[PDB]
Model the fold of this input.
Amino acid sequence: ADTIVAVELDTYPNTDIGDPSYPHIGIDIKSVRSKKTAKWNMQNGKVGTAHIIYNSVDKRLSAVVSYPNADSATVSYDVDLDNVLPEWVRVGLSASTGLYKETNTILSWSFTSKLKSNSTHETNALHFMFNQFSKDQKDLILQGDATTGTDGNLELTRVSSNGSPQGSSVGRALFYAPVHIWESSAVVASFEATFTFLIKSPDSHPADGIAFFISNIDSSIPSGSTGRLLGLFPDAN
Amino acid sequence: ADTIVAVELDTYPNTDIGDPSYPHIGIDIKSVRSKKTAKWNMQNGKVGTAHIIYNSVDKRLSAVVSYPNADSATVSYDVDLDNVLPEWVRVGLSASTGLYKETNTILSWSFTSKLKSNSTHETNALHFMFNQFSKDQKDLILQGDATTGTDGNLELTRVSSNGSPQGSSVGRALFYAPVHIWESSAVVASFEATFTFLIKSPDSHPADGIAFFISNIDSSIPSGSTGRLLGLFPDAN
Amino acid sequence: ADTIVAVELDTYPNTDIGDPSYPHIGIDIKSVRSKKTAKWNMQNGKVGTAHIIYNSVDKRLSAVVSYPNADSATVSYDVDLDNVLPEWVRVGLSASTGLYKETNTILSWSFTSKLKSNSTHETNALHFMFNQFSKDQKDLILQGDATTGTDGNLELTRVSSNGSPQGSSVGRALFYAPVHIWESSAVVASFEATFTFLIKSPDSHPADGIAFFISNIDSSIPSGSTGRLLGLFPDAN
Amino acid sequence: ADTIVAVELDTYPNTDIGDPSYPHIGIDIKSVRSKKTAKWNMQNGKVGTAHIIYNSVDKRLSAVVSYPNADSATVSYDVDLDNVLPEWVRVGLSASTGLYKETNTILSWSFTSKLKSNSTHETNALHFMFNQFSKDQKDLILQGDATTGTDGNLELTRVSSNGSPQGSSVGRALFYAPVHIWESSAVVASFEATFTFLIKSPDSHPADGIAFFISNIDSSIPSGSTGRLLGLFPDAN
Done:
């Protein structure tokens, strides 16, 4: 059903479905079994930053994850997204917890998309930036357990009053307007996404992760996609 | 019903409903009878450019209209939009023809909106730019006779195959995502809009005009708003 | 000699040279005696933010100063800068201490300038943003005691090893490239500046202030402009 | 002496110094003998557009050249610029004519550079855009025969009154401020450059080309670099 391309920040090693034995970042092209991963030194309770970049000339989707005063993790994959996704997509953030849990908090999110035509001085662009939310964030579609406005933050999975992360929770937030990622006359198409997140768990093995994704416009949370399937995939294939 | 703030480029003088005796640009706060106007030297068949700017510190909505190698027309009005509009709005372009007519073509449109909070490094922003359209422009809501894709342009009123403008036509295009123009913690809110247009009429008295507007999110074309009411107002009050 | 337009954040009341009896923000057009002031509730040791905006249609220079979780101070002045400044200027930050002192630290600085011509799709723009400095910041001209690189910050007045502010100190930082603020064919010219600052003083009466300024390109610190003259004016006239 | 990285649009085939037998675009890393080329279908008298992009995660410098209603030419090269260039550079445009000639006119030029640190919300950016020039363009360093202001255009090689291109001419324009392309704490560094150009020659074999380049800050035109050496290299090695 849904066409998903995602960059995941996966905190729990489900080695049975192909994860490496550590926290890792990965690029998922239509399956939870990442096409490419890298070890990520996840820091419990610290704000991190993820940068995702792509352009139609190189056809390389790359991601860099960093924490203050630390070395970065980075992963890249050669993929032409014109052959994977529809030309109109929606972009969003998704997260889950399963038996083990964590808060999946989003403190800011920006995205830029550009289509540069072969006509002179002809650029089509979309850009949004959220450094603060609203309880009534009318330009986000919130799905599952995601809520906005808690300390001006976006909470992708259920967090109870006392600040505790809840298990078996899944939530997603997608920007309202469709995003145009191809047009026939375009010489270069590019996008850039950045988000900062706070993953805090009282456990020694937090789970499950955060993912930035791009899907077909009508995408909704697949049934049973809590825990390891990150709110993105119906199964582990 | 709808809350409309608009900057109009009015090509026909309906002096009976308060227009001056010439083409003019004006600022309409909830009524077709402009709060402020200026003479506009309309050029038939030339591409013009309109720039509209506003910010919450000055509370002045100003507009500048220019044509290549010509002097500009400019109009300004002191108005606090937090006291006129809802905090979530949609923005768009509207046009009509009546007994006299003209093509109301839009060749590009950009908009930027910014909410800067009192928190440090906290800006929320939306920015779109259309230098080219699509027949299937999924991030625009097209109403009435507006169509996209004709020479990559947006045609706000009906134009027949041979390029001729049709009379009694009204059309509007609004960007899909709601726009947030106030929040409680904001120290400055601003927006900026620019569009280029081509008004071509085979008549000596073209009618009726183009307007950039900001309305409540569910705004739709009022019944009977062709001709002088620009697709914006239900009546001439 | 130098042509100075500045927005000052003045921490010490030199009522003898016209200050009000409190910390205040003011707009100086070629003299230290502000054309317009507003009371500013200065917070010792907190990071504040200043936003300065101007455009050639309204001809209003306005400034908003805020601290987290506090109400803002704002001041505005009707002034046409085409009649005060040359068309090529440099922009910068300046600060001083006198007998009383304070740290004048700059943690980030961004500026944008735009000249929009009457020709279609013709915008000339300059934009810089510094969220971090360098010991060797080659695109800043540092004058007097200003230094860069101390905790990635810009220190406009002398601070000794142990973190203490020094008295009788004056420093300025200007961006390297000239800025073009008028051209004959421009229909709208605008600029926007933002900076965050930390004023920390161990005294109950800190002095003297920070100012954002725009000057002629070859401007340098006037002789004797420590203390109340903010590194900007040769005298108190 | 100078460290040059350039993307050239080479109109004349000097097959003796390694050019292919056709107009071509190429990536030069410190030598006129391109590391990589692609056939370019040069159109005499038409305005073209060049887009150059690079980022420190992929380490791929790519360029796309297009003309209206035509197919694009594109060339890419894997190169880590931190190992080739200094961390402070200047960027510019260069062109030459030799025995055969052409006008090398620049109608617009924009550049963006970004350094994103591992600190949260810490981006340093420079952005300029020239859609129009000035006879007194004080933020460009013009070298050799380059002049500004002729029809608001930048003329990189000598053009005489009647509009004719002159032979044996070389000129360069560099933006005034140094550009910072690396810093120790940066997780991603990127830049983007775009320019539109008009190459018009009354000859059947125009020469020599236009190049976008990045050099050390004090770079100046090497002696004898007219014709095939594009104003960039001292020799053909």
DSSP finds no helices and 18 strands in chain D. The two ends of chain D are 14 Å apart (CA to CA).
